[PDB]
Design an enzyme around this catalytic site. Structure first.
Site, PDB file in Angstrom:
ATOM      1  N   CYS A 217       0.815  -1.208   0.000  1.00  0.00           N
ATOM      2  CA  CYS A 217       0.000   0.000   0.000  1.00  0.00           C
ATOM      3  C   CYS A 217       0.854   1.267   0.000  1.00  0.00           C
ATOM      4  CB  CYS A 217      -0.892   0.018   1.246  1.00  0.00           C
ATOM      5  SG  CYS A 217      -0.189   0.207   2.701  1.00  0.00           S
TER       6      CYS A 217
ATOM      7  N   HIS B 125      -3.706   1.444   6.777  1.00  0.00           N
ATOM      8  CA  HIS B 125      -3.590   1.635   5.342  1.00  0.00           C
ATOM      9  C   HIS B 125      -2.805   2.909   5.068  1.00  0.00           C
ATOM     10  CE1 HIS B 125      -4.329   0.927   1.190  1.00  0.00           C
ATOM     11  NE2 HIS B 125      -5.140   1.955   1.015  1.00  0.00           N
TER      12      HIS B 125
ATOM     13  N   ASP C 239      -7.476   5.641  -2.822  1.00  0.00           N
ATOM     14  CA  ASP C 239      -7.173   4.334  -2.244  1.00  0.00           C
ATOM     15  C   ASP C 239      -6.500   3.427  -3.270  1.00  0.00           C
ATOM     16  OD1 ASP C 239      -7.120   1.942  -0.841  1.00  0.00           O
ATOM     17  OD2 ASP C 239      -9.098   2.299   0.094  1.00  0.00           O
TER      18      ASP C 239
END
Ligand SMILES: [Ca+2]
Ligand SMILES: [Ca+2]
Ligand SMILES: [Ca+2]
Ligand SMILES: [Ca+2]
Ligand SMILES: [Ca+2]
Lengths: 214, 213
Positions: free
Chosen positions: A44, A157, A175
């Site tokens: 991520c 995240h 995202d």
């Protein structure tokens, strides 16, 4: 996946218009041009970094993948020896990166970074300083937050911010888990709450990073 | 390095053309799926998976993102019928023609209309694409010779995101993201680029409409 009611998905009429009525959206267009899907959840932060560094025009790695062209990719980000020295790709591929590690991995490419742990600031300064950045070219914002605190699954995240809607006091998260969630407009208080959480790997609060050219 | 005839999306002008556009329904879903081609030969694959992900077509089931399902360039050829149209190893070298692009999309049970430039005209192209770019649930992919719009150089494939009525320009979501940004190209330039003969196919290039059956 299902979007929590307090979130406004970018994949909607309302999510699209919140970008059109935003007066703090300069970063969205360069970031959109670089949007990538994380190689895996652990990456991520790598996906978010290369989005920002490509958007900055940072002179990129020269590898055989896309030679003679130069560009950051999740495959070649750790070609930089000092980047590997911060934390190895084999390790990031498992456990991801902390907020401090995120800042150092970026700084290892000669880029200027400012790491803001939530515990060291407040929501008012977060809203003000990030909204100012989102009005400015040549710099970007990456956020590191606990998904559960904004109604998503689930753990920590990392993803860049692209815009801020003044009317609704919502930030747009690009995202990088594109197979899982769309970009969402999230209320500042929800995003602050998710950043003001302790990363067990770090034993420090999460937060946000400002990136710019030195 | 963009030629004067092209207006880069990485520009204040390119941003205004999108904000002043009344034909931009497809940009937002396509932006969410924008990807970089694995290589030049895979420009078509990057283009297909952008559109199939945008359409919500049920995607392959692989270990990479399991339990989640999504079209990627690495898993697009997990479909045996897809690989039957043209193998990934050959596509990895020479890419895909307009006809092969359509058949590859059709290999996933998705409705496709292949439009060779020699079978239509610029007016109908402008008309039909501009309307598609005003509706959800369908998308446009173009196949064109880069030389004719001032780029380097051979045949390319990428989706269209929007149409600027005031300048008569289409925005190409160029999947050669390391090479070029998205460009606003005038309809005249894009048509002349589509109206070129691909030696591999011995047929003209063109565009494909994609929708759910
Ligand atoms: Ca700007
Ligand atoms: Ca900025
Ligand atoms: Ca973690
Ligand atoms: Ca729509
Ligand atoms: Ca459409």
């Amino acid at each position: 996946l299902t979007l929590s009611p307090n979130l406004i998905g970018f994949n909607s009429n309302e999510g699209e218009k919140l970008l059109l009525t935003s007066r703090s959206r300069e970063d969205f267009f360069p970031l959109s041009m670089q949007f990538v899907t994380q190689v895996n959840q652990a990456y991520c932060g790598v996906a978010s970094i290369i989005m920002v560094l490509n958007s900055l025009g940072i002179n990129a790695p020269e590898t055989a993948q896309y030679s003679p062209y130069r560009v950051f990719t999740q495959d070649n980000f750790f070609s930089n020896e000092k980047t590997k020295a911060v934390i190895a790709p084999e390790v990031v591929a498992r456990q991801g990166m902390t907020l401090d590690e995120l800042g150092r991995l970026i700084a290892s490419y000669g880029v200027k970074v400012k790491v803001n742990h939530a515990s060291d600031t407040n929501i008012e300064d977060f809203r003000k300083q990030v909204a100012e950045n989102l009005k400015q070219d040549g710099n970007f914002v990456i956020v590191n937050y606990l998904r559960k605190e904004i109604g998503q699954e689930r753990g920590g995240h990392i993803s860049p911010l692209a815009a801020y809607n003044e009317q609704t006091d919502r930030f747009l998260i690009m995202d990088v888990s594109r197979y899982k969630y769309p970009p969402v407009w999230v209320k500042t208080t929800d995003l602050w709450k998710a950043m003001n959480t302790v990363d067990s790997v770090s034993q420090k609060t999460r937060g946000f990073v400002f990136v710019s050219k030195t």
